[PDB]
């Protein structure tokens, strides 16, 4: 009837890719985060920001290419193309590291626009919105690492660059400087990721091994029409199996599939709380009862004090080349070496 | 070491001496458990989304499943039409058997491949090494991200077992 | 129209037998004519270091960062 | 009309000429440490 109704009926039309209202936020912003990454890893260097090479023009393969974080002198500037740093020039915008905030900002509005996509399709199909709530897990890892972690730090420079090996140094930068593995929020996150991979490997292998005979063929994939009301696997058998192997087992398909949602997602929320606590440098660095004892008793050694000496090697050896803006000129005689290494 | 801090003594010393992160079999099992926790929470949400009304709003959602029943407890056509619009139509498994097989394939193949990464790196066939790989025409070494990753490996290598070594190369 | 009925048709491969090589070679000429080094400011292998500047160039200012990169890219 | 397996054959070996070209330039040109 009205003008709003014609636009509402056009976006929600059955077509190849469902656009909806949320596609106006997703499809422009996701196309430019992805294309900003493919351009930045192919053409744009890191020679002026980090003093590296992170492009395909500079000989890096898929692994050692990245879209890199800007300089520490930029601080937390948004680095707009028209801004006071770039001033409209495209070429000087790329050399300062403007594509990285271009990827991260238009990417953050892609994950907004993709989670709104999951509320919109669920309302048209008419189902409960648990996909949009389980996808809030990965939103809490993008925001609290690519956004909330460099905000608490000195600049955008201490953020993960969007490249394969550039994530890998961020894994190593976070052990030596922060002792991230000791943090109980990672420990509750590893329990959800390795726990979530566990549940789909079991529920994959128990459904597929309690199937009913619905055909004479040896292939069991053929014997399932999608619109049938009979269940395709014996729940009573699978309960009787695991009650004797493992001792305790699900007797509820509604509780089972909810539990496959809770376990992976909670590991992304609990691990997201800790990385917000490392923006503020509130790290779980030491057990002081272990540290006061190892100072007074020069014979008491645990595995825990062995990890601190591994972190002095990370804090001293890479920090010269890690942070060229700070100009660490270490002598050879201050770098902690071991015996004969 | 059978412990918790002993595990991270094991992982870091294994990084300096073998470069596991650049090895493509740790790469094929990070994809196994990131993918595994994806398809876990992606399958577990689409079943819980499409549950059939069998309870009231006062009692629990889970009590609409009586144990050992023969009726199907969720509209599988509903969750197929949702994911058939969330990405596109042809990327959706209408077959629930082939769906519940792909949940068992992806992690297990990812951990078979990974556990034969530790095995082939037990015999000192390490991961990739792209240190000093990018040079200018003059021949000076241009750093990459692998050179920054190398300086993290050199810090752990010169500090692990700080008294056990006597000779310049950690052959063990 | 179904997708597999498109790519098996001849009229599809009539059009895209011209457009694909005319677009792949334009991606070749975008590099071999030295154009990509000037749009994105990526250093050529000749020009990581210069005769004067022998160190690693870094930006060291918030607001005159455009002017400082005008310095480090002339020589 | 073209048989579909001919299409996946010609495009499939075209990818191999693209991939093995990329593993070629890991040992030559830039990024080869020569």
């Amino acid at each position: 009837r009205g003008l709003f109704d014609l636009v509402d009926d056009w976006l929600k039309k059955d077509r190849f890719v469902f656009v909806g209202w949320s596609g106006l936020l997703l499809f422009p912003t996701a196309y430019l985060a992805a294309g900003g990454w493919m351009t930045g890893t192919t053409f744009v260097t890191s020679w002026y920001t980090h003093g590296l090479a992170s492009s395909y023009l500079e000989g890096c393969n898929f692994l050692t290419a990245a879209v890199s974080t800007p300089a520490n002198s930029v601080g937390h500037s948004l680095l707009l193309l028209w801004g006071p740093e770039a001033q409209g020039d495209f070429t000087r915008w790329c050399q300062i590291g403007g594509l990285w905030t271009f990827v991260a900002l238009h990417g953050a509005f892609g994950l907004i626009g993709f989670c709104l996509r999951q509320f919109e399709i669920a309302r048209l199909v008419g189902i409960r919105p648990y996909n949009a709530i389980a996808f809030s897990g990965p939103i809490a890892v993008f925001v609290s690492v690519f956004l909330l972690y460099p905000l608490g730090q000195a600049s955008w420079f201490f953020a993960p660059s969007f490249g394969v090996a550039a994530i890998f140094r961020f894994l190593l930068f976070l052990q030596g400087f922060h002792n991230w593995t000791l943090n109980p929020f990672h420990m509750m996150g590893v329990a959800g990721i390795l726990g979530g991979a566990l549940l789909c490997a079991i529920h994959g292998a128990t459904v597929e091994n309690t199937l009913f005979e619905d055909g004479d063929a040896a292939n069991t994939f053929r014997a399932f029409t999608p619109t049938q009301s009979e269940e395709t696997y014996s729940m009573v058998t699978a309960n009787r199996f695991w009650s004797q192997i493992f001792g305790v087992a699900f007797s509820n398909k509604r509780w089972l599939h909810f539990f496959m949602l809770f376990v992976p997602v909670t590991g992304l929320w609990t691990s997201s709380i800790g990385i917000v606590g490392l923006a503020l440098n509130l790290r779980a660095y030491d057990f002081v009862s272990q540290e006061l004892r190892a100072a007074e008793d020069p014979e008491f050694e645990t595995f825990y004090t062995k990890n601190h000496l591994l972190d002095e090697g990370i804090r001293a050896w890479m920090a010269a080349q890690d942070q060229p803006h700070e100009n660490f000129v270490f002598p050879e005689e201050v770098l902690p070496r071991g015996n004969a290494l | 070491p059978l412990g918790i801090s002993g595990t991270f003594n094991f992982m870091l010393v294994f990084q300096a001496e073998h470069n596991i992160l650049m090895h493509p079999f740790h790469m094929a099992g990070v994809a196994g458990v990131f993918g595994g926790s994806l398809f876990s929470a992606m399958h577990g949400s689409l079943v819980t989304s499409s549950l059939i009304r069998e309870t009231t709003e006062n009692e629990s959602t889970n009590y609409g499943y009586k144990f050992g029943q023969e009726e199907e407890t969720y509209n599988i056509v509903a969750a197929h039409g949702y994911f058939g619009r969330l990405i596109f139509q042809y990327a959706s498994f209408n077959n629930s058997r082939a769906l519940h097989f792909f949940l068992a394939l992806w992690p297990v193949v990812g951990i078979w491949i990974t556990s034969m990464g530790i095995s082939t790196m037990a015999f000192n066939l390490n991961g990739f090494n792209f240190n000093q790989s990018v040079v200018d025409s003059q021949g000076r070494v241009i750093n990459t991200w692998a050179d920054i990753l190398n300086r993290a490996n050199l810090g752990i290598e010169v500090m692990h077992e700080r008294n056990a070594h006597n000779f310049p190369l950690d052959l063990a | 129209r179904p997708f597999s009925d498109i790519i098996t048709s001849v009229r599809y491969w009539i059009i895209h037998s011209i457009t694909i090589p005319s677009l792949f070679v334009s991606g070749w000429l975008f590099i071999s004519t030295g154009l990509a080094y000037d749009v994105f400011g990526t250093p050529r292998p000749n020009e990581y270091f210069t005769q004067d500047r022998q160190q690693v160039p870094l930006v060291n200012d918030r607001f005159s960062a455009k002017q400082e990169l005008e310095d480090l890219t002339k020589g | 009309r073209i048989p579909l397996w001919l299409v996946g054959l010609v495009g499939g070996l075209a990818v191999i000429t693209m991939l093995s070209l990329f593993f070629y330039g890991s040992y030559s040109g830039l990024g080869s440490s020569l």
């Binding site: 196309y31 192919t42 | 040079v135 | 334009s26 975008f30 | 070629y24 830039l30």
Partner: peptide, 28 residues
Amino acid sequence: FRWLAIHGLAIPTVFFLGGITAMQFIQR
């Protein structure tokens, strides 16, 4: 029409692969 949907993703992809094959033959 879906010619704008695919070719927003495929016309760039062949253009960048025209550049990635050219970078294999560039040396110092």
